[PDB]
Amino acid sequence: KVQTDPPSVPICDLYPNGVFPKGQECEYPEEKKALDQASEEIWNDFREAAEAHRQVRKYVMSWIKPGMTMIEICEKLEDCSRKLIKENGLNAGLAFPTGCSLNNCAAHYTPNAGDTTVLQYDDICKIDFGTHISGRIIDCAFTVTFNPKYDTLLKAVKDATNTGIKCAGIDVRLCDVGEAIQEVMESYEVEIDGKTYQVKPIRNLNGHSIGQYRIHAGKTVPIVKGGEATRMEEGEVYAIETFGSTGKGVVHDDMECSHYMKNFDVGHVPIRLPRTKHLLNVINENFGTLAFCRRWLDRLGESKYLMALKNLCDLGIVDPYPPLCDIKGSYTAQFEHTILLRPTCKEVVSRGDDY
């Protein structure tokens, strides 16, 4: 129909012909039109996922407020995402857990069960959540703040992300994208509680190509100079994300781990330990090679699984992705879109009227 006040209509029911809205189409910085059209079912699946992401995030921006717990925020977001993507096993669903990393933490925090963290007025929270249709994944992310003191830090990172998006293209060197992002990001100076800083890109965080059911398909997009001159290629899909910091501009692993994901290259492994076998079966049926978090095991009724999960990590079947944080007292921000390198044009598929 039309979407409801608090969104509840699946995107696929809003577009009855099954043709979903294009994102922003850009010229790059005959046969190729036939090539583009031959993969139209794929582009269309990304667009369906991107429209779910646009409607979910608009809803989130309407209610996210200090005083909510991080668990309340993530469950209310994920509820809406499951409804609008019309969750259906591995055919449609959430691509990876809801990041809501706070303050000096830049990526890969979501709360586990029991976490009592409450969002504060002075917090800077990176909302990074993903949707997919048939494994075509949108990774798109924005920063939430309530104090206007962070406004220039947010503007720096947004401008750096849009610069990486504009520089991207077929035959562009990945190192050139990183150099461009850094030059824009470092042109910003900010003042927060009487201290001034030049914004720095977080050098050991990266954008990344995306493959089917594969959030990180192996090519990395640097956000500082000095990276690889490997080129982007026609048909590739990238998460162009940047992270800026008032700290060292370097993240380390910190806090409890919540995010896990099966190693894409690992195939069948016979396991006889009962609890570890069961948990591997649960992961294979519900997530495949998509990332998941502990809250998502809890909701499937799993319990007593932490030792099984460690076993799978120690076997190398699953990998842990702990929160990634700069130094204590620093502030980090993130903006991100997914882009499609179509034969005829570059589509910023997750672009919205918001960012």
Please state the closest distance from residue 95 (CB atom) to ligand OVA, in A: 8
128 in catalytic set: yes
Look at residue 108 and give the partner it binds from ligand OVA, Co ion, none, a contact being a CB closer than 5 to 8 Å depending on partner kind. ligand OVA
CA atoms within 13 Å, Cβ hemisphere of 331: 25
Catalytic residue among 128, 159, 176, 347: 128
Q: Closest Cα to residue 106, out of 90, 92, 131, 124?
A: 124
C-beta closer to Co ion: residue 139 or 347: 139
Look at residue 107 and give the partner it binds from ligand OVA, Co ion, none, a contact being a CB closer than 5 to 8 Å depending on partner kind. ligand OVA
221 lies in the site for Co ion, by CB under 5 A: no
φ and ψ at residue 28, rounded to 5 degrees = -65, 150
> Does the annotation place 108 within a ligand binding site?
yes
Q: Closest Cα to residue 93, out of 261, 287, 303?
A: 287
Site residues for ligand OVA per CB under 6 A: 96, 107-108, 205-206, 208, 215-216, 220, 259, 261, 291, 321
How far is C-alpha 94 from the chain's CA centre? 11
139 in catalytic set: yes
Look at residue 141 and give the partner it binds from Co ion, ligand OVA, none, a contact being a CB closer than 5 to 8 Å depending on partner kind. Co ion
Tell me the CA distances in angstroms from 287 to 175, 261, 277, one per residue in order: 33, 8, 15
Across the beta sheet with 324-325, the strand order is 105-107, 324-325, 252-253
Q: Which residues are within 8 A (CB) of 197 and not within 5 positions of it... i.e. 6 or more apart?
A: 189, 190, 191, 246
268 in catalytic set: no
123 lies in the site for Co ion, by CB under 5 A: no
- Helix H, strand E, coil C: the string for 33-51 is HHHHHHCHHHHHHHHHHHH
Out of 128, 159, 176, 302, name the contact with Co ion by CB under 5 A: 128
Could you tell me if 107 and 31 are in contact, meaning their C-beta atoms sit under 8 angstroms apart? no
> Does the annotation place 208 within a ligand binding site?
yes
Look at residue 231 and give the partner it binds from Co ion, ligand OVA, none, a contact being a CB closer than 5 to 8 Å depending on partner kind. none
Please state the closest distance from residue 215 (CB atom) to ligand OVA, in A: 5
139 lies in the site for Co ion, by CB under 5 A: yes
Catalytic residue among 48, 51, 78, 208: 208
Which residues have a catalytic role annotated? 128, 139, 208, 216, 241, 336
